[PDB]
Amino acid sequence: SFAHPGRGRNVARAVPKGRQVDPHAKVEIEELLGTRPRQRDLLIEHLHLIQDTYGQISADHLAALADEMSLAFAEVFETATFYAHFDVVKEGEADIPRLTIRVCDSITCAMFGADELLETLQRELASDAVRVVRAPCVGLCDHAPAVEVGHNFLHRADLASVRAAVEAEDTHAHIPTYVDYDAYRAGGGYATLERLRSGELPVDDVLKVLDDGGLRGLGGAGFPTGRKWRSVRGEPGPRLMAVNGDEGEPGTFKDQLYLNTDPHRFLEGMLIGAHVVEAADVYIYLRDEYPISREILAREIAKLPEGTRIHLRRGAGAYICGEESSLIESLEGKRGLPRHKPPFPFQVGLFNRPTLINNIETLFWVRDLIERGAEWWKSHGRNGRVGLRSYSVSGRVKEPGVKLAPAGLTIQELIDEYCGGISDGHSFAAYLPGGASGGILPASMNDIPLDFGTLEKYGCFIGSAAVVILSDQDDVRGAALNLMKFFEDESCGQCTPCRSGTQKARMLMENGVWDTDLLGELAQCMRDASICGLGQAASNPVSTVIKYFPDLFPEPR
Template sequence: MITSEVIVGWMNVMTGKEKRQEAGIWKQSRGKGKPAAKGRMLDELALQQIQACVEKMPKRRDLLIEYLHRIQDSHGGLRRAHIKALAHWLNITESEVVSVASFYSHFDLLADDAPGLPDMTLRVCNSLSCTLAGSDSLARELEHLCKGKSVRILRAPCMGRCDRAPAVMAGHNPVDNAIAADVLEVVEKRILFPSLPVYEDLDVYLKQGGYAHFRALESGEMNAGQIELAIDAAGLRGMGGAGFPSGRKWAAVRAHPGPRLMAVNADEGEPGTFKDRYYLETRPHLILEGMLLAAKVVDAEKIYIYVRDEYPAALKILTQELEAMTQHGLIASDFVELRRGAGSYICGEESAMLESIEGKRGLPRQRPPYVAEQGLFGRPTLVHNIETLYWIARVCREGEQLLRQVERNGRTGMRTYSVSGRVVNPGVYLLAAGSSISDIILAAGGMAPGHEFYAFQPGGPSSGLLPARLADVPLDFDTLQPLGSLIGSAAVVILSTRDSVRMAALNMMTFFHHESCGQCTPCRLGCDKALTLMQTPTWDVGLLTELGQVMSDASICGLGQAAPNVFRTLIRYFPDEV
């Protein structure tokens, strides 16, 4: 029987325990008590430092990656004391902060007693285009010349500057067509941020009739149905790689009850791709108007723009122009949020990008549910990439015939090709969607002197490598699948007879091996095993074929599903080289 004396005794025991907890002392019936609670103690100075970094920002869990950027930028790394302080401030566990920070390659986790990072970090691009332009020898030369300097040299994946290869990122300052002397000058002068390129700002865009359709939607002079009809009539499909019809995507999002959100994918990490950077750094308001029109059609209550950390100029331009739009009364100050990536290719996958915007590790989600139903913060979400928004704005301004009137090789429409490698004039080319690789090489000024066309990558590493004999095939949606390839992001890299397709394939698979998020076994182990098999003198074609089938069938997202195209296309088209 529980008597009143027993109850009083329990109360006394609990009261004593609470007092010990309040004092930070945990004492059992036997042994000595601890003078402090278990775990890392909070450093008050570190707490003050992180609060200074984020003082003008709202306190929200989804902003974790933004906070980490601020701390990394201010203190040259993420010390354990700062991790503890940030976790304390957000009321989350340290392990949660470490888990997120360690996922992204642009964050440096440092022990409290570890020496600080060098004053300057040089990231030398090791993508295919930059490798063809001599980035390997440049990296070795910089390592030799920077000995004794407070400089850290890292090899890094594509920075979206393939038209200006080789590229080096000095802090946040890109050095294009880099040679050692130019890089050393940047190091000596400590130029850590780029100057902005000349671009079309809000005043210029408004004088040219910009935002007229958005204002008409706002005032009721036009309705969302008219915009959707124009986009459907133009036949616009998503330009991020999947090619899903834009109008159908809008309908899919609207089919689910609000509130709805929109996310803009400006995280073009596919090596060889730089068209989004080009548009953001030259005509940002075409992108922003297309964004506002699409958001209005699906009645999105807020927009998030996710931009690569490798695009500091684009980030600065967007920050300035969104502020100008707010001052001009086009948007509310909290309607659009800019989010900065942190060096993870997988965040270009739409669901992984949404996870990153939520302040998490960028791991692709299982489907269903699709993001149109349960996307950002569990809400129906419209996701568009930069080029798609570019075309939405242009079709609305210039009419559906803009795309319908252009025809080439039986294909209708236009698309933007990022062209690099062995051509005279690497760059962004707006061509008919049915253009062949012969057309693209011609537009880029022909083959570079001393080079003869041998092979090409039609749509980033995910598309593999195709031989020169397929030079007349249209590079568009649905035309390359029968060839074991795909158009992807239309990242075209040209190789010549002086290049080794085997070494190019190794470069591409090394990228996938490095960028696999590790969530699913077929991709994580598949990329590792494929890279090992591809490094042997003679490939085990049977084993690679079997491995590729498993990766394609069982991987969660497009990385693992498309990575086998690298070795499949070589086995199919270049059997003598494997």
């Protein structure tokens, strides 16, 4: 019995510092991973694998997973909590209910009553066995209001059909009928690609057809696809390719359409690009909200002969992962934080290798542009523009949906010639030419050709051509608030003008009166100092609403 110089008024930790790894959760995650690689760039997939198996990511599983992958606790927690679809449950936290119901609250579904539907589905159905939550646009705006029950997306949903899907345990995704490998080959599929590969079709011929056709980035930025392809292949190898299937832009849904109808057309246009730039592996990054598209691509990639390795990856609820550098970061198993330019992805991208990145739709058209030539593509067009373009039209139209139509249509032409005009009892008031990011234009400016370039004069851009039509029954200022709420949630948090700016603007826009001057100074700062295009375009709704709808600000400054 010996004294000691310490204070003697504290007790030592029974265990080492921090939280510990549980032996049962370690055994369970050992069993769950099987022989899958414990490499870092599979972190998001293994988090999908714990969430899909157990319905949640408990901390005891998260800790076993970081230990199995040699990662720090903060690295896995950092990454997991970045993505909206991962439920991390700590000590003292309840478990996630067995069934999850997600109700979209983006602009189009909100126009058809999404907020009230969320409240109604919450009072009537939420319980210990059902969780009811909001979600951003899930690419079903032509079926607004969209609601997800498990992995089953209900179109034009109400309480009756969602109640019927729950009580029927109707929670799996319904796979439609599509053009499969046998049917695709019977229509001459995988012919242009094989001629390109074998040697008869020269690679320089492919690059020439693209430059002549003028195929531009259908993901929204409109960069010339041939110019990009030459740039990637003009870089020292090894090179890689990544397919952007995030389609997270509210109002956009053309990629989901082409995937669920004719997937191998996209797969061949992809494998063509993979051959032009000599990519060892291709990565398809499909957003989590497309489980129908996920099962279709899983089935059809397996039907392909054994060539280029195709890695199908799965998003986890994050609109920022549609930015090329953020998608790359997400593919490497990290938080989706955009990188700083320069360098650009075509030179230092996925795994610091020169990386070719293309949108689902851009690759979809490669096969046809080659077999039919550039002059067939440039034959279509309107008002001085050339080429085809897929417009995702939602809102107050009689016939919403993807409209493959000539580039350069006016919004008046796109609505009367392709969408049956405005809905019954609505008058054309405003439209979003480029989804959330492209700003809000009034109905009186309906004579502006819609294509890359034509809208910048007006502070807008066509972007992904997510066309949303609003009417006099809709609220234009409430439209811009819904878009700011979206960006405030989607902002990856990296930099001040976007992280704080989106939040500050949303807070200001909820006052009865808008302080347009302060929003003006902030908008200027956001597009001038934000790192990436999310913050650079987040204020585009507010700026255009202030400029093009003076009647919506009666009060004096």
